Design a protein around this ligand. Structure first.
Ligand SMILES: CCCCCCCCCCCCCC(=O)O
Ligand SMILES: CCCCCCCCCCCCCC(=O)O
Lengths: 282, 258, 234, 68, 281, 239, 68, 68
């Protein structure tokens, strides 16, 4: 049928009755319920406005940059290790996205990933360099990781991967929800292990929080081309959006800039609000 | 009337003449795991009355300089009754809770306490040297619980409480403004109207059941939203009962680090 | 095989795209859902929750717990005791509340706004307060008289410890900008004593009020935007 | 095996009823075996604010005094 | 079948008390006479139509509305030229604004197409890799980036397009986004009303629609790091209204525009050509 | 999987393109329509509005209000009072009327055109005016005698203060060009006194008439083009 | 869920009656969720110039004296 | 000559029994002369591990003495 609209206003006259929607108590844990038809005389207003952009699917429906990886394809032997870059799977690298995801304690969604590539000659002297193809592969936790760009694990017999030619449409892939729980948690008030009597006098300092608990493996990105006399700096940006998303148990937004992957604060930025001269100053 | 209540669980009864109604978080009454959502195969244990008792925590004093108090919920009950014992006998468990908070003050007292139940009450570490560097012991204060401060003084290394949580009150110890804490199930005890508040919560996790020794599903936060004042010190007593509990995976007796 | 023509927009990446794509993990078993409590379907469900207003913005009460505590005295006064500019997203006092923060992810908004107050003084003290909303394009409510001319209620302190004032959606525009747009002026919310707080002997003579802000049911938002409240190093 | 749905209205479109004209009609076919590959879901405008704004065990009425 | 213009009916000589050829312009009505009223006419059949002048057709083409300038700089300076933030408007272009200004009010969806072009402006030509550009929309109230590498380019909510040079010109559809039911091409008013206690000098940009127009900005950047050999990229933005209705028609401007509003330049107050005489054909 | 072949025309930007495209702002809630008075559905609806002709474009009248005032006098003269080339989007006098301005955006046009004349003299003034139109051939009339050998109306000045003449669609072509063109020249419009204006004592001897032009109901246009009537300095990108 | 309609005629077409041949038909399908993404609408050629050319409360007939 | 089959369940499905209506389907058309050109086969979960774990000539029941 018609997408349901927000509350319409019924007309009303003055009230001298003993019903009093104007007075309440919030001590009960309930919010106030009063609307203009309870408080003032009103006219009828037809309300057809729709809360669509506030649906969670819409709220989380745009791809955000998550990470930027630096790769260099170079002929200098001392730079060979820079031919590839292994990144931990995470969304904690960029603050604008974390801010919205962390609104919910729990969530379930499928993930869309895309990549954006760009390249330049970081060196003083440029020269002819052929079009590079990039290999993006996922290495699940426990899967072997390459020690080098030409490491045999890039055979990728099981590990899924993408080969992208620079300049063609930015690559894209869908990832189904991969939790081992019935939801991803955005928080974890606990420890990976329970230290027992004896052992370490006061352990847990190295394993408290979500940062310890959920290991999603790594994404390995290599250049696939052998080196050239002129070298290239290549930047890859990883973008993400939840798709087909549900959330539970809402939380306050963060006021303090994040001190990395934990919930930690920096002493230099714990003052989120600006002052106003007084209560009576507009 | 809504103001007068009696609640019973197991063998213990709580009564009050000045209740702020009652809250059931999300409108969802605590329950047991259905066969359709069962995760472990092991036949469950349902201790019923042996653990579903209202237990008291050591009370705290509300002073005019207090900034707040906090507890980890399954942790605070670990020290008592069969609930506390079963958590060291089984790998997995589930528990909903009924939390009753009372603050007895005269009509001449003013001030108010916000009581919030927060899923996943993860707190910041009090150091700039490491991320989330908090030890098991200092993250799990049990029956005693912890408190809040109004200053942030992260420590050098582990010289003092460098493995303990930061606890700014205005930011709830985590970097979020306290003024938005009202998103969480909550009640306020205004000394002008009520002397108590009761909140019932379901088990909340990404799982149907989890290990109580590793994961604190809920925490309790109490704040002096309106300052205590009088014409003062007022004790606050927090009484908690688990409900609809289940245990699985009988294991070796677990004894956590002291 | 089949003749086709590529149109403008081909081979570009839009962050707003809603297209199908091949699965990187074929035939993957998604861990079955459970009835996780507290489901949220829409952000407006959070917009309607009453949260506190950090009204006590005076230097020294800023970024502390006292920030949410509005002082009241039994001293006779005709002074304003409260001054908000309404814009939920741009008002320094509102932009950090949950309603304001949700709105800082949106460009435009509509609907009525509710302001709820709780008296936390002695049980013994009584009195009446004037809570008032004055539409924009007017001299600020300098005194009680102007506050009385606008939309208002009187809160008679008693057992019902709280009250709600509603600032109806009176706007020339359908939607107002969340941004500090001088064109879409919020109007003014203020408060005056209707009468001096009556305080009997041997009670505190200085007490606090808490205020809350929330969306009304006719409330909504439009286009999504980046919030200016968070940042990071490069 | 295409499915169809009402398109959201635009500038020259009909009233908010969105019932006027068969021409408002977006047509779609899924091309992959994993539903994770499908485009985003239909807007779900179902709401239940009581879970967060009025989770009171007692029946509370707006006209009744909150207390009693 | 679509409607055609009216056909003309056949007529003959007329001698009657009817006066279709006479009127009273003072009434505000236009004359109503057609050839069949004034001269003998033949029957004709008109199959000609007016779809070519319907509003959708009139406004049916994309126009260039602005030019942005982006530079990839290998120098210590001009890093700032890697990105360009422009106020969204159509007033930079006279042909398009003149067409839109035929109406006081309008309602339409809008689509945008961009055209990128680049050169190597320096004498020191050399290799440059194919570049990629990001077009980010920054909604009103959203933060602006301070630099091409500023964190706000993360675009978690702000929508954006990543275009690789050489692919089909990038494109996107924008719905009608007014906060009014129609867009206002003109506004005889002020954003705010100065009150009695305020200074009598009360202009200060408050007057005109310009003061109430905030549609955000468009921020475009090269997305790469500097390359030793530099690039100057010109981005032409095109706009085409779609699904358009308009109201309350008005005559077009005959003189050159001065800025954003209807201000006039003293050098263009005399738009029409002179003739030798009234009686010259 | 489905084999395809890209045709010529692929990956090009046509300003006339009518292909579908992704929405940058998905699920946006569009402000509802309201009734607004004066809806215009076709530009031709504006073309049919009678507007003034800046006929008196002679030195000293050009670009001022007197430009729209056709002089009339009680003097006896066989001379024409005015002449117009019927080229509605070319003639200096017609290209800036509302009809001309709409037509300035079109390449080709057709159908009859109406000319309405309003006499603004005193009530006391009388006389008769001859309006005449002839097809684009032979010679422009410079004499009432020849003006009569064509389409014409004689207007009795009286209580009905206005009258009109319609130049019928006479053309060898279906559509004439807007651009000045001898091949497609539209004909000639002139006016002569039939009877001199007669002025009683205390009435002014000079009068003005306001001429108007508009599209007739059978009028149409074929093809859009840019107007050589507005310009600007070259646009340079912000930097 | 395709829309089917008549094309505008060209050089080799019929009497501009669009009632002669089915070869003048064309089809289209909307591929996006928002209607703003669709092609331009079918042309509405209904016109009513009288609202601008003769907006007179008390109607005159064209052959009547404008003023009696 | 298309076939319509259901999709494997994604995050949004509350029916892990594949029973949420037409919502979850995909359409496939084979475009080639040989079947070797077709996409991967339909999943077939039929299994029979007794072939490798209990290939016993004599039927054994789980509570039977393995040997009498
Ligand atoms: C070939 C690419 C496969 C990459 C699979 C890595 C897992 C992606 C999900 C990462 C986010 C998990 C945590 C969360 O959603 O809250
Ligand atoms: C992702 C890009 C979004 C662009 C949003 C702005 C769209 C055009 C706004 C209307 C232009 C002004 C019209 C007027 O002057 O009345």
């Amino acid at each position: 049928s018609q997408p349901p609209s927000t509350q319409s206003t019924e007309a009303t006259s003055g009230v001298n009755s003993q019903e009093v929607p104007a007075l309440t108590a919030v001590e009960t844990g309930a919010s106030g319920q009063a609307i203009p038809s309870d408080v003032v005389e009103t006219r009828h207003v037809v309300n057809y406005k729709t809360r669509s952009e506030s649906c969670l699917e819409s709220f989380f429906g745009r791809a955000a940059c998550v990470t930027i990886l630096s790769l260099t394809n170079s002929s200098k032997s001392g730079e060979e290790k820079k031919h590839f870059n292994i990144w931990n799977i995470t969304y904690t690298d960029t603050v604008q996205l974390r801010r919205k995801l962390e609104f919910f304690t729990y969530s379930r969604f499928d993930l869309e990933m895309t990549f954006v590539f760009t390249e330049n000659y970081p060196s003083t002297a440029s020269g002819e360099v052929r079009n590079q193809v990039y290999q993006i592969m996922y290495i699940p936790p426990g899967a072997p990781r390459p020690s080098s760009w030409d490491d045999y694990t890039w055979q990728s017999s099981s590990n899924p991967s993408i080969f992208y030619m620079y300049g063609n449409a930015p690559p894209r892939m869908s990832i189904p929800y991969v939790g081992i729980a019935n939801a991803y948690s955005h928080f974890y008030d606990g420890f990976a292990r329970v230290p027992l009597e004896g052992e370490n006098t006061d352990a847990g300092d190295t394993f408290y929080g979500l940062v310890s608990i959920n290991d999603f493996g790594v994404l390995a990105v290599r250049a696939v081309n052998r080196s050239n006399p002129h070298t290239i700096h290549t930047s890859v940006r990883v973008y993400m959006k939840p798709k087909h998303i549900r959330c539970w148990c809402p939380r306050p937004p963060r006021a303090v800039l994040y001190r990395g992957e934990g919930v930690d604060m920096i002493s230099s930025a714990i003052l989120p609000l600006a002052k106003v001269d007084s209560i009576t100053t507009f | 009337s809504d103001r007068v209540r009696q609640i019973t669980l197991g063998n213990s009864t709580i009564t009050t003449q000045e209740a702020a109604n009652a809250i059931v978080a999300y409108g969802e009454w605590p329950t047991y795991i259905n066969d359709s959502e069962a995760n472990p195969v092991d036949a469950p244990t349902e201790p019923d009355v042996s653990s579903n008792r209202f237990y008291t925590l050591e009370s705290v004093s509300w002073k005019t300089t207090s900034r707040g108090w906090w507890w980890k919920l399954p942790d605070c009950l670990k020290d008592m009754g069969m609930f506390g014992q079963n958590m060291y006998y089984h790998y997995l468990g589930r528990s909903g809770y009924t939390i009753h908070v009372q603050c007895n003050a005269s009509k001449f007292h003013q001030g108010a306490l916000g009581v919030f139940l927060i899923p996943e009450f993860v707190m910041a570490c009090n150091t700039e040297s490491k991320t989330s560097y908090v030890s098991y012991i200092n993250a799990n204060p049990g029956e005693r619980g912890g408190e809040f401060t109004n200053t942030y003084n992260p420590s050098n290394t582990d010289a003092s409480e460098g493995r303990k949580f930061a606890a700014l009150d205005y930011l709830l110890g985590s970097g979020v403004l306290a003024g938005n804490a009202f998103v969480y199930p909550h009640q306020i005890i205004n000394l002008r109207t009520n002397n108590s508040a009761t909140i019932v919560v379901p088990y909340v996790n990404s799982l149907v059941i989890d290990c109580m020794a590793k994961h604190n599903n809920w925490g309790i936060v109490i704040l002096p939203l309106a300052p205590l004042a009088f014409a003062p010190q007022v004790p606050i007593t927090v009484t908690i009962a688990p409900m609809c509990t289940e245990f699985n995976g009988l294991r070796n007796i677990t004894v956590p680090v002291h | 095989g089949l003749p086709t023509m590529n149109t403008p927009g081909s081979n570009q990446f839009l962050t707003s795209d809603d297209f199908q794509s091949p699965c990187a993990l074929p035939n993957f078993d998604v861990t079955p859902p459970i009835h996780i409590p507290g489901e949220v379907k829409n952000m407006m469900e959070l917009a309607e929750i009453d949260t506190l207003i950090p009204m006590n913005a005076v230097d020294g009460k800023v970024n502390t717990m006292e920030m949410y505590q509005i002082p009241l005295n039994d001293n006779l006064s005709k002074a304003p005791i409260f001054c908000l500019s309404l814009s939920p997203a741009s008002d320094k006092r509102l932009s950090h509340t949950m309603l304001g923060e949700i709105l800082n992810y949106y460009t435009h908004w509509t609907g009525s706004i509710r302001f709820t107050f709780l008296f936390c003084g002695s049980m013994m003290a009584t009195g009446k307060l004037l809570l008032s909303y004055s539409p924009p394009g007017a001299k600020p409510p300098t005194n009680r008289k102007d506050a009385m001319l606008g939309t208002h209620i009187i809160w008679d302190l008693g057992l019902q410890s709280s009250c709600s004032m509603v600032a109806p959606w009176i706007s020339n525009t359908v939607y107002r900008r969340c941004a500090r747009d001088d064109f879409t002026e919020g109007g003014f919310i203020t408060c005056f004593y209707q009468t001096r707080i009556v305080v009997p002997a041997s009670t505190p003579t200085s007490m606090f009020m808490l205020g809350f802000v929330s969306a009304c049911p006719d409330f909504s938002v439009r286009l999504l935007r980046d919030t200016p409240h968070i940042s990071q190093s490069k | 095996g295409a499915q169809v749905s009402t398109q959201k209205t635009g500038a020259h479109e009909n009233q908010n009823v969105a019932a006027n004209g068969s021409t408002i009609n977006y047509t779609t076919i899924n091309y992959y075996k994993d539903s994770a590959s499908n485009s985003a879901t239909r807007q779900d405008l179902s709401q239940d604010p009581s879970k967060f704004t009025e989770p009171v065990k007692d029946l509370m009425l707006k006209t009744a005094p909150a207390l009693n």
